[PDB]
Structure formats: C-alpha cells, structure tokens
Amino acid sequence: QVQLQQPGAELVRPGSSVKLSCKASGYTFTSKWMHWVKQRPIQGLEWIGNIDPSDSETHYNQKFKDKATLTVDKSSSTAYMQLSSLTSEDSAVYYCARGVTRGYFDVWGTGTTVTVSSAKTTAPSVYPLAPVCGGTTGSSVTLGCLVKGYFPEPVTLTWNSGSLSSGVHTFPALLQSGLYTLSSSVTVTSNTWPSQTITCNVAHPASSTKVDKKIEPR
C-alpha cells in the first residue's frame, strides 16, 4: 500500500546543489508528517528535519541549517529537499520517511545515495585472476575477477552470463582516490575447470561498457 519512491543515486561536484524528491502514494499525502533522515557508513542515523503539509510546519535540526531547505509540492505529490553547501561530509544515504505527528516514523523511502566528489565518470577495466602455475590444492579450484579503477557505483558482476551463481562471493567496493576497486571470488570443483568455459561479465551503465573476460590457465 504505502510506498515512498525516490530516485536511485545523485552525483554532484563540491559547491553545487542537489534537489532530492520523494514520490508518495498509498495514503493521503497532506495528512501525515514527512521526515528526512541522513545515514552515514559508520556514524549512525541522523535526523535532518520534517514538514507537515496542512498547516505548513517546517522543523529543522539546528546542525542542518542552512544546508537543507525543505519544500513540498502537492500536485504532484512530492516532498523536496535541497542541499545547498555540499562537501565531502555530505556523502551519505538520504531517507524519505512518513510519520503520524512528531516525532516518529512509520514507513521509510527507498533511499537515495548521494556522492559528493570532484571525480569524473570513468569506465571500468576488468582483469582475469588465475591460480598458481601448475595445480590447485584439493578438489575445489578458486577463480577471481578483479575490477579496478571505475567511477561511479555500481557494477553488475555475473559469472557465465548467469549460469554460475552457487559459491560466489562478491566483495563490496572501496574508494581509492576517485576510482573504485571491486573483486569477486568463485569456488568450483576441478572437474569443471579448465574442462568447461568460465567467464566473468561486468557491465557499467554510466559508461555503457560490457566486458566478458575468459580466465585462461597460466
């Protein structure tokens, strides 16, 4: 029923501004309070402010003035949030939230990930990782696919076009001077490799890239 849809990700340079929105349905928008919450990696949830469209009431966190300017649109149906300053401090996940009066929240939005960086959008690389020269110890062989130097997130990594998914560990990317680095491991038996073909597939929507790299034995 109650759904609070908001766009995926926004990527804006330091200094400039962002206008976040929240498409609300499943309930009467003009009846219940709309709150905004900021979540950072390892610092916890931080409440920003809240608007009541009735009765126009706009509350703010004293630490968030005047970085955030909250406005609403009734048509159309949306709740807006403009971030004015934008610094490396602002890089976080911003959540839409419905609530009945102050000050707790019932339903949360999908969340928009905001990345404040001076870096430019760049294409990925993709590298094949092969085991040691000779043989692998045991019966289970381990293969990898290293993706180094790409901006921004995300990247969809699939093995064998989607035919291989069991025993796959995809590791979250880390920021390394403007460009991300991601790795993924796969564990299969020695009877499948290198007897059958194994290929890691990486696609980046922001750069329109499609790389299929075959792991050849050393």
């Binding site: 102050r102 929240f105 969340g111 590298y127 094949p128 290293l146 979250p172 880390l174 491991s185």
Partner: protein, 212 residues
C-alpha cells in the same frame, strides 16, 4: 540533545533463545522507539511508545523500560531477525538515534580458506601490480591480515573489504589487496599473505614466487 547509547554494539545469538538489547539515555525520556534495518534494505518501525508494536511486526518482539534505561527483548531468535537495531527519542528535539545494536547470527567456529593470486599480465602492462589474497568462509568476523614481502612486512597500499554475514552458512569473507608499482613488484621475489584468526594461533599461510 540527549545522547543515546545502545549496548552492546555487536550482538551474537543462536536461533531459538531469548535476546535482550538495551538502550540508555542521558536524561529522563517519556517514550521510546525502535527501528529494524536488514542489510541492503530500508529501515522500518518495530516498537512505538516503548511498548506497542507496529503493524506487520511478528509476535516475538517486545519492549519495556522507563526514564533512562529501556530494552528491546526478542523472546525467540529467528533467522530473519539478523539485522541492525536503532534507538530513537523525542521530548528533547532533537530527535536523535542510538549507535546501533548489530544483531549477528551465531555459527559454530569456522576456519578461513586462503587463495593467493599473482598480479595479472594485463595490469602489469599498465605499470601497476596488485596482489590479491582472498579469505573465504570464517567465523567470527574479526581477523588479522599480514602481507610479507621476502619476509619483511608491508603496511601501506593495503586494501581490506569485508562482506555481510551469509544467509545460508552464516560465515564472513574478506578481500585483501596490496597495490604496488611494476618497479616495486619486480625488485622482490617472494609474496605472502598471512591470516591470523581466533580459531587457531598458527597463521594460515599461502604464498608464491615471482620468478616461477
């Protein structure tokens, strides 16, 4: 303006046993609110005004407390409960959250599996050389990595990324990657990644040679 401290920070509980999580406030508080957030999903309201339960909340969650000390109790721990839990307060505007009690599912001690990979020829073409060491399937999360080049330890240029607890076997996995230049890589021969886990004092050692 009240500071809320949730204790403990990381919870470890086995399925089918009582779970008591606590939040502590700086000063007197009238009503408390709790929030559940599963990995890769939006948070949701669990308990409101301390005691009462939100719609859609399974019958196993309970809340109580007063003034400064408040508690969320799970009568019987289930697999779909492994999530981060957050404190929430009013009557002091803000309107602040707690640190976040991470409820992590319990598993019988697991030993890490190590696979070391030499830098690819495609990267060595560019001038860079990244040695990747995969640490797969281990319990618990806490582990130590030690990169040794020809015996000597290296600390700068090391990248370490952990995964969230698996839904099937409930084990952690991390990726250790040391980045070096083509000049720095070819000056030395032996490259070792050591895994120091709680399961065994003896480090799990996987290494290779450059000239071979």
């Amino acid at each position: 303006q009240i500071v809320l401290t949730q204790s403990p920070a990381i919870m470890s509980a086995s399925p089918g046993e009582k779970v008591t999580m606590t939040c502590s406030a700086s000063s007197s508080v009238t009503y408390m609110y709790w929030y559940q957030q599963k990995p890769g999903s939006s948070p949701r309201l669990l308990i409101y005004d301390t005691s009462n339960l939100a719609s859609g909340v399974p019958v196993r969650f309970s809340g109580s407390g007063s003034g400064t000390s408040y508690s969320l109790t799970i009568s019987r721990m289930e697999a779909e409960d492994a999530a981060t839990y957050y404190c929430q307060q009013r009557t002091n505007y803000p309107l602040t959250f707690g640190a976040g009690t991470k409820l992590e599912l319990k598993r019988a001690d697991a030993a890490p599996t190590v696979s070391i990979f030499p830098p690819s020829s495609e990267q060595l073409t560019s001038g860079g050389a990244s040695v990747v060491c995969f640490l797969n399937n281990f319990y618990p999360k806490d582990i130590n990595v030690k990169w040794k080049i020809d015996g000597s330890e290296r600390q700068n240029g090391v990248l370490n990324s952990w995964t969230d607890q698996d839904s099937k076997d409930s084990t952690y996995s991390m990726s250790s990657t040391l980045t070096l230049t083509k000049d720095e890589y070819e000056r030395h021969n032996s490259y070792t990644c050591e895994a120091t886990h709680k399961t065994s004092t003896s480090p799990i050692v996987k290494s290779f040679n450059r000239n071979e």
